[PDB]
């Protein structure tokens with residue numbers, strides 16, 4: 189049905205079923221040096237997120253114009269510190285924070301970002317980028333600025349010798365490598381009824397009773413992750429992710445950056461057993477939503493000794509302790525084993541996973557081992 193942009197891109201066609209593994213087109217051995225042309229009156233600006241004024245401009249763009257949840261009651265609320273965590277992992281490059289501004293006023297009307305990541309896709313491990321935070325101001329919508337943003341970040345990533353990318357979207361584009369669903373678990377139902385995040389089925393008081401949790405976790409030895417846990421968390425994660433077909437491959441520095449706890453950004457808890465050994469961990473990140481609503485998002489949960497269902501029940505208890513109103517998790521990895529048992533309900537809409545310039549068979553949600561922010 190005619191994707192005018194995506195039909196020119198090195199991606200599989202929709203409905204074409206891929207039994208091969210590999211690049212769609214050859215690597216470019218000479219790359220366009222000039223930026224692509226924006227519509228009249230707009231210009232590229234690389235955003236330095238170390239400048240507090242510029243970082244404020246970006247989260248103002250994103251808080252007003254970014255992904256809205258399905259029924260448009262709520263939009264994500266991004267703190268500066270959350271953006272620094274997500275946009276400056278190890279290896280971040282300044283040209284990959286790619287802004288669009290009005291020429292005359294220098295107002296920030298658009299953004300797209302790339303961060304480097306090593307991606308394990310089936311039997312191949314390849315250095316790639318993760319594309320995130322594509323955003324166009326509500327007043328600039330449907331002007332074909334998004335294809336220019338995408339071509340321009342592609343060129344900038346090509347200049348660094350990286351020809352593959354991974355990204356997610358809620359829309360269907362050619363062609364998903366995997367499709368996931370959102371599930372939500374009510375922590376503070378009373379507050380969720382007011383914003384109309386939820387509704388009563390049947391009584392206010394038995395809903396609270398249905399969703400009530402213990403005040404402290406069940407698992408012995410659960411404690412926040414510390415610096416001395418970085419190597420074992422790294423080793424548990426790498427071994428755990430081998431069972432999935434699409435996963436990140438993290439160095440120990442990346443493990444520190446993604447999992448080391450930062451208040452109101454990311455929490456990690458390890459299970460240290462009676463021997464002093466760390467056998468398990470759970471993690472979730474913080475993303476509030478504006479009308480605020482404090483939501484937790486399952487990140488990476490690794491179990492060796494503790495059963496997965498016990499780990500996630502403890503995660504729910506910890507999130508509630510910290511004042512989260514809701515706990516969100518995708519149906520990927522092993523999550524379908526605890527989702528219904530722990531009283532998650534299913535959300536609206538799909539998260540589709542994609543590869544750029546890598547053709548490969550699609551996979552079931554349970555084989556997707558990658559969580560983005």
Ligand SMILES: CCCCCCCCCCCCCC(=O)SCCNC(=O)CCNC(=O)[C@H](O)C(C)(C)COP(=O)(O)OP(=O)(O)OC[C@H]1O[C@@H](n2cnc3c(N)ncnc32)[C@H](O)[C@@H]1OP(=O)(O)O
Nearest residue numbers: 191192193194255320321322323324329330332333334351
């Ligand atoms: C080797 C390195 C490669 C690196 C690049 C890898 C590829 C990365 C690709 C980007 C990864 C994004 C990862 C994330 O961050 S996903 C989150 C995307 N952000 C939002 O949804 C925030 C709110 N919405 C917006 O800001 C705008 O609606 C956006 C910017 C999404 C589109 O702006 P607009 O509404 O004004 O439309 P247009 O006239 O300018 O252009 C319309 C074109 O956009 C296609 N479209 C719509 N939505 C998406 C989407 N989420 N991914 C890819 N394509 C998308 C559409 O099919 C059409 O093309 P085609 O149908 O004619 O063919």
